[PDB]
Design an enzyme around this catalytic site. Structure first.
Site, mmCIF file in Angstrom:
data_model
loop_
_atom_site.group_PDB
_atom_site.id
_atom_site.type_symbol
_atom_site.label_atom_id
_atom_site.label_comp_id
_atom_site.label_asym_id
_atom_site.label_seq_id
_atom_site.Cartn_x
_atom_site.Cartn_y
_atom_site.Cartn_z
ATOM 1 N N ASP A 93 -50.445 -36.054 17.769
ATOM 2 C CA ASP A 93 -50.859 -37.374 17.454
ATOM 3 C C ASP A 93 -51.885 -37.851 18.720
ATOM 4 O O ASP A 93 -51.278 -37.854 19.725
ATOM 5 C CB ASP A 93 -49.853 -38.281 17.283
ATOM 6 C CG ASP A 93 -49.753 -39.822 17.193
ATOM 7 O OD1 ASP A 93 -50.976 -40.148 17.338
ATOM 8 O OD2 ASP A 93 -48.972 -40.446 17.210
ATOM 9 N N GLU A 151 -51.623 -54.565 43.820
ATOM 10 C CA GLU A 151 -50.548 -54.033 44.828
ATOM 11 C C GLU A 151 -49.801 -53.065 43.971
ATOM 12 O O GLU A 151 -49.554 -51.710 44.221
ATOM 13 C CB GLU A 151 -49.491 -54.935 45.475
ATOM 14 C CG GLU A 151 -48.444 -55.591 44.593
ATOM 15 C CD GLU A 151 -47.622 -56.877 45.315
ATOM 16 O OE1 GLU A 151 -47.057 -56.459 46.251
ATOM 17 O OE2 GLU A 151 -47.674 -57.698 44.699
ATOM 18 N N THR A 152 -49.404 -53.424 42.593
ATOM 19 C CA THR A 152 -48.615 -52.755 41.611
ATOM 20 C C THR A 152 -49.138 -52.993 40.309
ATOM 21 O O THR A 152 -49.359 -54.237 39.989
ATOM 22 C CB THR A 152 -47.038 -52.822 41.923
ATOM 23 O OG1 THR A 152 -46.872 -52.748 43.165
ATOM 24 C CG2 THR A 152 -46.355 -52.397 40.888
ATOM 25 N N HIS A 212 -47.806 -47.760 41.996
ATOM 26 C CA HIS A 212 -48.080 -48.276 43.248
ATOM 27 C C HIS A 212 -48.720 -46.949 44.418
ATOM 28 O O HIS A 212 -47.844 -46.219 44.413
ATOM 29 C CB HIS A 212 -46.705 -48.999 44.097
ATOM 30 C CG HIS A 212 -47.278 -49.475 45.287
ATOM 31 N ND1 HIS A 212 -47.549 -50.868 45.347
ATOM 32 C CD2 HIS A 212 -46.763 -49.069 46.447
ATOM 33 C CE1 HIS A 212 -47.562 -51.052 46.715
ATOM 34 N NE2 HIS A 212 -47.125 -50.020 47.316
ATOM 35 N N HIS A 238 -44.345 -28.077 15.135
ATOM 36 C CA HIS A 238 -45.272 -28.923 16.376
ATOM 37 C C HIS A 238 -46.331 -29.499 15.606
ATOM 38 O O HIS A 238 -46.780 -29.122 14.628
ATOM 39 C CB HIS A 238 -45.519 -28.280 17.547
ATOM 40 C CG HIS A 238 -44.240 -27.836 18.470
ATOM 41 N ND1 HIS A 238 -43.161 -28.470 18.854
ATOM 42 C CD2 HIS A 238 -43.890 -26.480 18.418
ATOM 43 C CE1 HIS A 238 -42.421 -27.839 19.612
ATOM 44 N NE2 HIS A 238 -42.529 -26.478 19.185
ATOM 45 N N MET A 289 -43.705 -32.763 25.493
ATOM 46 C CA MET A 289 -45.097 -32.578 24.687
ATOM 47 C C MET A 289 -45.734 -33.959 24.697
ATOM 48 O O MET A 289 -45.897 -34.717 23.662
ATOM 49 C CB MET A 289 -44.452 -32.100 23.306
ATOM 50 C CG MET A 289 -43.901 -30.898 23.361
ATOM 51 S SD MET A 289 -43.944 -30.072 21.593
ATOM 52 C CE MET A 289 -45.576 -29.558 21.598
ATOM 53 N N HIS A 307 -42.736 -47.947 41.412
ATOM 54 C CA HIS A 307 -42.011 -48.901 42.302
ATOM 55 C C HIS A 307 -40.810 -49.510 41.716
ATOM 56 O O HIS A 307 -40.512 -50.512 42.113
ATOM 57 C CB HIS A 307 -42.896 -50.195 42.869
ATOM 58 C CG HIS A 307 -42.740 -50.363 44.220
ATOM 59 N ND1 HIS A 307 -41.765 -51.042 44.576
ATOM 60 C CD2 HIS A 307 -43.555 -50.347 45.406
ATOM 61 C CE1 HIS A 307 -41.843 -51.363 46.043
ATOM 62 N NE2 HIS A 307 -42.856 -50.966 46.284
ATOM 63 N N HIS A 353 -53.363 -41.227 20.224
ATOM 64 C CA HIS A 353 -53.703 -42.428 20.298
ATOM 65 C C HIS A 353 -54.896 -42.958 20.205
ATOM 66 O O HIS A 353 -55.311 -44.273 19.949
ATOM 67 C CB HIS A 353 -53.092 -43.222 21.368
ATOM 68 C CG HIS A 353 -51.266 -43.248 21.282
ATOM 69 N ND1 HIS A 353 -50.649 -43.782 22.338
ATOM 70 C CD2 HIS A 353 -50.522 -42.574 20.560
ATOM 71 C CE1 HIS A 353 -49.341 -43.651 22.117
ATOM 72 N NE2 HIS A 353 -49.240 -42.770 20.880
ATOM 73 N N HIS A 382 -49.456 -36.871 21.740
ATOM 74 C CA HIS A 382 -48.177 -36.367 21.982
ATOM 75 C C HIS A 382 -47.672 -35.753 20.536
ATOM 76 O O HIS A 382 -48.356 -36.170 19.624
ATOM 77 C CB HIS A 382 -47.071 -37.343 22.246
ATOM 78 C CG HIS A 382 -46.949 -38.846 21.365
ATOM 79 N ND1 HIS A 382 -46.025 -38.681 20.356
ATOM 80 C CD2 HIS A 382 -47.255 -39.979 21.534
ATOM 81 C CE1 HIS A 382 -46.372 -39.486 19.609
ATOM 82 N NE2 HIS A 382 -46.914 -40.697 20.405
ATOM 83 N N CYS A 383 -46.823 -34.918 20.545
ATOM 84 C CA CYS A 383 -46.301 -34.135 19.503
ATOM 85 C C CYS A 383 -45.534 -35.379 18.622
ATOM 86 O O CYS A 383 -44.605 -36.443 19.301
ATOM 87 C CB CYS A 383 -45.273 -33.180 19.972
ATOM 88 S SG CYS A 383 -44.587 -32.185 18.370
ATOM 89 N N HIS A 419 -39.317 -34.497 21.005
ATOM 90 C CA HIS A 419 -40.461 -33.506 21.497
ATOM 91 C C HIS A 419 -41.204 -34.276 22.709
ATOM 92 O O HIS A 419 -41.398 -33.601 23.418
ATOM 93 C CB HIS A 419 -41.220 -33.046 20.297
ATOM 94 C CG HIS A 419 -40.760 -32.093 19.468
ATOM 95 N ND1 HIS A 419 -41.530 -31.042 19.034
ATOM 96 C CD2 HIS A 419 -39.383 -32.113 18.705
ATOM 97 C CE1 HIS A 419 -40.771 -30.247 18.192
ATOM 98 N NE2 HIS A 419 -39.540 -30.793 18.007
HETATM 99 CU CU LIG Z 1 -43.457 -30.572 19.394
HETATM 100 CU CU LIG Z 2 -43.366 -51.115 48.438
HETATM 101 CU CU LIG Z 3 -47.349 -42.423 20.084
#
Ligand SMILES: [Cu+2]
Ligand SMILES: [Cu+2]
Ligand SMILES: [Cu+2]
Ligand SMILES: OC[C@H]1O[C@@](CO)(O[C@H]2O[C@H](CO)[C@@H](O)[C@H](O)[C@H]2O)[C@@H](O)[C@@H]1O
Ligand SMILES: OC[C@H]1O[C@@](CO)(O[C@H]2O[C@H](CO)[C@@H](O)[C@H](O)[C@H]2O)[C@@H](O)[C@@H]1O
Ligand SMILES: OC[C@H]1O[C@@](CO)(O[C@H]2O[C@H](CO)[C@@H](O)[C@H](O)[C@H]2O)[C@@H](O)[C@@H]1O
Ligand SMILES: O=N[O-]
Ligand SMILES: O=N[O-]
Ligand SMILES: O=N[O-]
Ligand SMILES: [Cu+2]
Ligand SMILES: [Cu+2]
Ligand SMILES: [Cu+2]
Lengths: 334, 334, 334
Positions: free
Chosen positions: B90, B272-273, B248, B87, B143, B299, B92, B127-128, B138
């Site tokens: 990473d 709203e969303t 939402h 494993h 992960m 939604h 971002h 994330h892995c 993964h």
């Molecule tokens: Cu992993």
């Molecule tokens: Cu709705």
């Molecule tokens: Cu990524």
């Protein structure tokens, strides 16, 4: 308790929108609307495929309701005894009680009256949401529409300039899930209840059989094309209650676009394609510069051309050769 | 070389978030975190379906890490010998070496220590990502988590006003791919390795079997509902490491929303969303105005109701009849 | 009628872009481009799967065309007699006649010349659109590219500061639909016409078999990796003519991003992942801070790793240990 003037609205079927003011000198009012639920078997394509629809006011989408910020919207929801299922209504524009759904559950033979204050500007979805697995089923069966909450000073560009439309259309997009039999033919059902098991199995696979505007393939074409003239500013409100869409006016642009649909935010300018999040409405305005046919599509072109999601505009006026010209017509290669 | 004060953080399981300051008078620190990988068979639905999960700190999502701009984040990643696979991690939020992945690949029985400077504000996925086809596997096995990098002056509305939340929740959404046998029943596997072939075949078809918050259908419901009171400003951080989502709050709004999740950009208002791009985190804040139950959903209502992607808030306080009222309860149609 | 200077452009194959000015002291010109349609069977993956491609200038995507606001773009579209089908071209940047499509339909053996005025700034898709069900088929067969319409003062950050790139790359993403036989092997076809029935049946199910950059799995890797140096500002233009994408630079960021692709709008800052709506182009700029390998992906990681949608950058320069460092290399757990 609430002592304000009352105003009744006569709703009209989409894609048209009931008459309204943009900028207004009116103060807050109680604006009264009535929606009557209709469950009905309808035809959704030019091959004659049928669908067990569930609708507000007999249409997919339900009608556009238009009010101004600070109005109180009072809706009478009616579920006639000719229907089979309980229904309710949830407004994304409203605050509390699951958007109203927790206060409007009605059996066949009943009606209910809900009031909500329009504290948030923009275009918003409304939809039925009876509870549990019924929620997606009622929505994708057609039970959704939109409301537009205007600023009292009308729309602006964010940059103190007014943005006034000459006309507004409401394009409601519906993802539909029609199961197929062993042959590969679409199935027909005698009731919404009978369509439920097969339809839910398909729904959970997340791929619609049809994606349509105004309830049917080709609804907004031919005699029912949308219309404009060169020089007209048109507002197109677009909603999708369950699934994303990517509107595009072929041959035009979104001159001013609120893709998240909310007028407290400035519009973006000069878009080619915009994005309506599933569970939302957005709005785009365009001033037509050229006559002729335009297609208004979702720009997943498979959905547009093959699954049903194309509308047309027919535009009158004078061709502008500065903007575009055929310098040399099709000819044999030298 | 780097001579700054060191501060240890005790991570807590989602949806809760470890205690932190918003606006701070502290200067840059080295903030120390530990993540211990756990591979484990878990139950993901109320029917008892099992899943071969791979997690940071035993949870899906992994815990939210909170720091301020200009801090140095020092993570000890631990891969105990009880696991079967290599494993890595990473971030971002980080710059270089594939987000750290190229510097943190560890076999069972090993640990590694990575430091990165928090130069970019916002909420970010981690994330892995071990390499090749293992990367999606993964991630969709669980992960992934998120980190929040706050401005030292706290959040603002873009328009010089401060935006202070009373509480923050982290909702990690996971798309899961559980294959079915010939009967149509979900399959169970004795190890992640044994689940790999069938799971990859399903993954490449791009349709999840489940979409869940906090690792399981119904995780953020009942006793584990999210809570608030009328008048409280709540920040909801939402991440999705692989697939789009459209959050939402049913009965509410996003009063201030960073849907791309980055605090160098002003928030949008009154949504709203909103839309969380696969591979990102976003954040929305809302001040509760009404008591009662709210549902927090993606939604796509099929995913929300039928595939697992619904959380609840239970909110205490006084009902506001100005904002919404049942004018007439369900009654027989006149 | 139109008496302006004429300038010819020599188009180059993606991911490279023909030489151009950013900010310019030139006034409007008629900029002349030629596109020659080529239908051809190509290999799209490292296993040798073949595909019936349809292309502008022999490439997927078609080449990037670059002009400035207020230029007139004059395109000669050529459909040699060696092709089998009619074709046309629709520019999202243009106004009227379905983007030009209604004025450029040409049979094998014909050519046509279209001029349009570049009134809208940004990056825009162009694509073939012959009519009806042919529209999606031609697009997903490869017949799409992009044009970039620059402000005459070059790019800015919205906040009066100039944004000048050192180099620009065009990454065109293509969703491809290759049917499988009973065995489970990808099918090969002798002509585009013969591929049509099976390909349309698959297309309507909305799940691609491949998602690739620059026409093939691994196209922008190895010898054909994208390149940069620490300190270089790189503009990445990304288009997708049919389906959404979520670009992400692994180990970097989008320092300035126009995800809807239109330079009349200020860029967003400091993104992890951005969103290209199907039927649009967007652009992101990043100044490299670290050397090494970066992957540029759509952050649906199944698509990236398993379906083909990964490019690499190889970056030269000095490692910055302040930004990131391996404090302790992999070691046995104490
Ligand atoms: Cu992993
Ligand atoms: Cu709705
Ligand atoms: Cu990524
Ligand atoms: O278009 C909304 C956008 O415009 C700004 C000005 O940049 O505010 C205008 O719109 C508000 C809402 O209608 C008005 O109240 C305000 O007076 C007007 O300037 C932004 O604040 C807003 O996000
Ligand atoms: O909310 C971010 C947004 O607000 C602006 C002002 O319009 O800048 C504020 O936030 C910055 C980042 O926190 C501060 O550095 C700045 O002092 C403050 O005005 C925008 O520049 C920014 O996009
Ligand atoms: O980046 C575009 C964004 O910047 C603003 C200033 O906030 O305007 C700049 O860009 C315009 C288009 O290039 C110029 O015409 C203008 O002079 C310049 O200030 C915004 O108006 C625009 O949305
Ligand atoms: O129900 N048809 O008008
Ligand atoms: O691993 N269960 O707590
Ligand atoms: O057509 N091949 O170069
Ligand atoms: Cu209903
Ligand atoms: Cu073509
Ligand atoms: Cu198009």
């Amino acid at each position: 308790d609430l002592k304000l003037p009352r105003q009744k609205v006569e709703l009209v079927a989409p894609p048209f929108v009931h008459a309204h003011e943009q900028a207004t000198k009116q103060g807050p009012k109680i604006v009264e609307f009535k929606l009557t639920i209709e469950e009905k078997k309808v035809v959704i394509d030019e091959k004659g495929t049928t669908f067990q629809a569930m609708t507000f006011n007999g249409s997919m989408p339900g009608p556009l309701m238009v009010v101004h910020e600070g109005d109180y919207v009072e809706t009478t929801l009616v579920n006639p005894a000719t229907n089979t299922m309980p229904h309710n209504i949830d407004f994304h524009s409203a605050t509390g009680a699951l958007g109203g759904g927790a206060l409007t559950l009605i059996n066949p033979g009943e009606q209910v009256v809900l009031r909500w204050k329009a504290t948030k500007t923009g275009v918003f979805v409304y939809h039925c949401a009876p509870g549990g697995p019924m929620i997606p089923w009622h929505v994708v069966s057609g039970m959704n529409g939109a409301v537009m909450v205007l600023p009292r000073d009308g729309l602006n560009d964010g940059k103190g300039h007014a943005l006034k439309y000459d006309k507004v259309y409401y394009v409601g997009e519906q993802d539909m899930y029609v199961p197929r039999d062993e042959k590969g033919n679409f199935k027909s059902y005698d009731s919404p209840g009978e369509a439920f098991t097969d339809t839910e199995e398909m729904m959970k696979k997340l791929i619609p059989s049809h994606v349509v505007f105004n309830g049917k393939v080709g609804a907004l074409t031919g005699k029912n094309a949308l219309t404009a003239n060169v020089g007209e500013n048109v507002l197109i409100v677009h909603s999708q209650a369950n699934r994303d869409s990517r509107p595009h006016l072929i041959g035009g642009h979104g001159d001013y676009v609120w893709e998240t649909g909310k007028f407290g935010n400035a519009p973006e300018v000069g878009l080619e394609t915009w994005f309506i999040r599933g569970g939302s409405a957005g709005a785009a305005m365009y001033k037509f510069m050229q006559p002729g046919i335009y297609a208004y599509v979702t720009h997943n072109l498979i959905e547009a051309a093959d699954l049903g999601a194309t509308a047309h505009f027919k535009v009158e006026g004078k061709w502008n050769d500065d903007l575009m010209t055929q310098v040399k017509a099709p000819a044999e290669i030298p």
